[PDB]
Amino acid sequence: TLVKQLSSNFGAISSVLNDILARLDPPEAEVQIDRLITGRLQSLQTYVTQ
Amino acid sequence: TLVKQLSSNFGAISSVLNDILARLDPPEAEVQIDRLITGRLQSLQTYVTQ
Amino acid sequence: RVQPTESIVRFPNITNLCPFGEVFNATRFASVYAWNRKRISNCVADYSVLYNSASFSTFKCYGVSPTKLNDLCFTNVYADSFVIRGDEVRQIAPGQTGKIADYNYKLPDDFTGCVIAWNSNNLDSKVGGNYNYLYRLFRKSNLKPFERDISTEIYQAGSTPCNGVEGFNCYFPLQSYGFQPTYGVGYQPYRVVVLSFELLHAPATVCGPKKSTNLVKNKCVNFNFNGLTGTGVLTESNKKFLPFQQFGRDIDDTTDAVRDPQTLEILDITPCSFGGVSVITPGTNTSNQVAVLYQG
Amino acid sequence: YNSASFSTFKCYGVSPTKLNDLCFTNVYADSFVIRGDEVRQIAPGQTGK
Amino acid sequence: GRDIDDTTDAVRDPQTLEILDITPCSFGGVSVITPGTNTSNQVAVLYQG
Amino acid sequence: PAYTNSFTRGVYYPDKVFRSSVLHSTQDLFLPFFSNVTWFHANPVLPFNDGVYFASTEIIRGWIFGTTSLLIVNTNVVIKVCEFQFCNDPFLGFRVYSSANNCTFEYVSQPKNLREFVFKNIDGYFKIYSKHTPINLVRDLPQGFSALEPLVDLPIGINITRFQTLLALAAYYVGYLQPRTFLLKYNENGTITDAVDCALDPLSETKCTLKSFTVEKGIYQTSNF
């Protein structure tokens, strides 16, 4: 489950990081990157608690 | 760790409420204080669970 | 909680006033591809008198509220000036791209300060067109935050090496404006002054007009030391500060000492007493008495 | 661009060097013959016969 | 190709039509084996995997 | 031009704040420990990559910086910073420049030992640190600690890449600073007493991770590969 969680939008436009970095300007792509980062930290806090 | 998690920006401009409140009007400071609130709440939740 | 009683503010006694008029309405500015930097320091500024009155087309302050620009201290306020195309007055903003945005003047993504512009279609709208104002069009790569370039070399496009022939695929890197006094708003010249300043660099001296107040000790008070705002109890201590040091910290990076700018004396900061409140009750069936116990 | 010195090889809105990377849809081609002095008339936002 | 958890494990060369395996680069964690600072200053280093 | 090594030399106060009985970790430009420092005799054009650790055991008065133009001499001090026309042999007799055409900032101050200096250019400043300490061992930079203290902060903001010494018609060492992370140790008086280079040896990284100067028996995870 922890591995499979790496393929979810979490609200951004795409799960793949490279697509976001190569499709949008930096100052606007930062918010999508931050959405992905928040999702994946919240996915690592679980699997440590459990 | 709990105390040291108070000098992090969490995405805002500065990790000091008394600094943010002295540089931004109320319309444009609640998009910063909110990031601080989210970060500090998550820190407290982790501490309490452990 | 223990509520504060009075408030004190201490700013250094500085008399000279920052020269702003010498920058804003000067005889002639420079081109957009070569902009000068006027460094302002060691004076008492006043941004409100520049905020109200007069006539400025745009007054956009990024990362700071223009209203509150007269109580917080700063560190070596910078000033930049140049003449810009009418439609590009909005192109100088953090992040957004453009021709002159990445070829003439690139602001950082975290820029703090105020962008000031006003109409300049009276003295800079020459009848034949001012040909002195010049902008760049071609460059190998984009600029970096706060970068300037003056060098002019023949641009190269693909094959047919140029090496200074200004022929096929070779262009002169920079082209002029031309300012006829009958153009539309999209062509009319505009004048821009960019104010930028760093906050956490050093305990500098440029500050807004704020009258000082007498020092008080051993009382939970609100203080304001050179833009450092907080509540605490100011005492007199014996910690040895080296002559160059100003502030002081502790194990967990909290200001527990400070030097007042005027008297130049060491003062400590101790938070006012806190604590929770617990009440002991024998149950509301036998009696209605209680006993409060401040914990800390 | 590596050809017999196209006299007026000048694109609008897009840099010719960046033409290859971007993908367009359904390009049209117009072909005709005019005089040398009339070549300057073929341009957006320009008038003349 | 994918195997069990949506991770790419083999790809086909688009020009020669050959199947190529994909394996991650080597990573791990550097550790330091020390007998104590108050006894010596000689250490050994263990790369995890 | 011989070659020698430094022994935990060239650590300064990085910030203006005061700390006592604290173990701090700063990330700035520092001279790496046990680095190879040149040892000249008595003056070519010495490169100015990022910073310079100039130490002399004394005749050595000046430091003309610039690209092809700051100047410091020892009247006591003049720091005329403007376009000069340097000569082939810039010594103090005395011909060092031709004229001051577009001259700028000009700060004249009031008109057995080891002298250590550090010069830097960050965001438009020219920082100088210094510390005069006594010594009885001739040359051969000793073992110990001398924390350099800030001296001046010039708001110049120019393009310095080459510097040369103004010999007074004499040995001086030149080491170059690099981006490194240190673990400074303050005592109760607020003075720097010891330091650890967190990129020199595995044991140093272990000390840096635990935030301590002593390591007990065991195995610890330091970083990733």
Ligand SMILES: *[C@@H]1O[C@H](CO)[C@@H](O)[C@H](O)[C@H]1NC(C)=O
């Ligand atoms: C213009 O210059 C005059 C100097 O006589 C003075 O009012 C001030 O420096 C400037 N004011 C404005 C609004 O630019």
Ligand SMILES: *[C@@H]1O[C@H](CO)[C@@H](O)[C@H](O)[C@H]1NC(C)=O
């Ligand atoms: C102004 O401040 C200085 C400290 O920098 C102080 O010595 C001096 O007395 C002050 N001026 C007056 C009139 O008190």
Ligand SMILES: *[C@@H]1O[C@H](CO)[C@@H](O)[C@H](O)[C@H]1NC(C)=O
């Ligand atoms: C209160 O106490 C009395 C005797 O002490 C008992 O009879 C009564 O039930 C109690 N009532 C409640 C609400 O506890």
Ligand SMILES: *[C@@H]1O[C@H](CO)[C@@H](O)[C@H](O)[C@H]1NC(C)=O
């Ligand atoms: C067609 O014209 C182009 C443009 O000058 C030239 O590069 C190409 O060689 C020509 N083809 C032939 C077959 O002549």
Ligand SMILES: *[C@@H]1O[C@H](CO)[C@@H](O)[C@H](O)[C@H]1NC(C)=O
């Ligand atoms: C692609 O072109 C190369 C060049 O000769 C050839 O060897 C290869 O077989 C071609 N691939 C396909 C799938 O036709």
Ligand SMILES: *[C@@H]1O[C@H](CO)[C@@H](O)[C@H](O)[C@H]1NC(C)=O
């Ligand atoms: C190191 O060990 C020796 C003897 O084993 C002891 O005397 C000394 O106090 C120890 N050092 C420290 C710092 O504890």
Ligand SMILES: *[C@@H]1O[C@H](CO)[C@@H](O)[C@H](O)[C@H]1NC(C)=O
């Ligand atoms: C410095 O370099 C020289 C040769 O470049 C070498 O002989 C010398 O051992 C080096 N210094 C140290 C301390 O290793």
Ligand SMILES: *[C@@H]1O[C@H](CO)[C@@H](O)[C@H](O)[C@H]1NC(C)=O
């Ligand atoms: C500084 O001087 C060097 C030559 O020493 C030159 O190459 C460089 O372009 C100049 N400017 C900057 C910003 O480095």
Ligand SMILES: *[C@@H]1O[C@H](CO)[C@@H](O)[C@H](O)[C@H]1NC(C)=O
């Ligand atoms: C310096 O001044 C001379 C005349 O005294 C002038 O010709 C020259 O352009 C000036 N240089 C600069 C960089 O302003």
Ligand SMILES: *[C@@H]1O[C@H](CO)[C@@H](O)[C@H](O)[C@H]1NC(C)=O
């Ligand atoms: C701190 O400084 C005082 C001042 O003389 C000195 O007496 C004391 O020994 C110092 N503390 C040390 C060196 O640990």
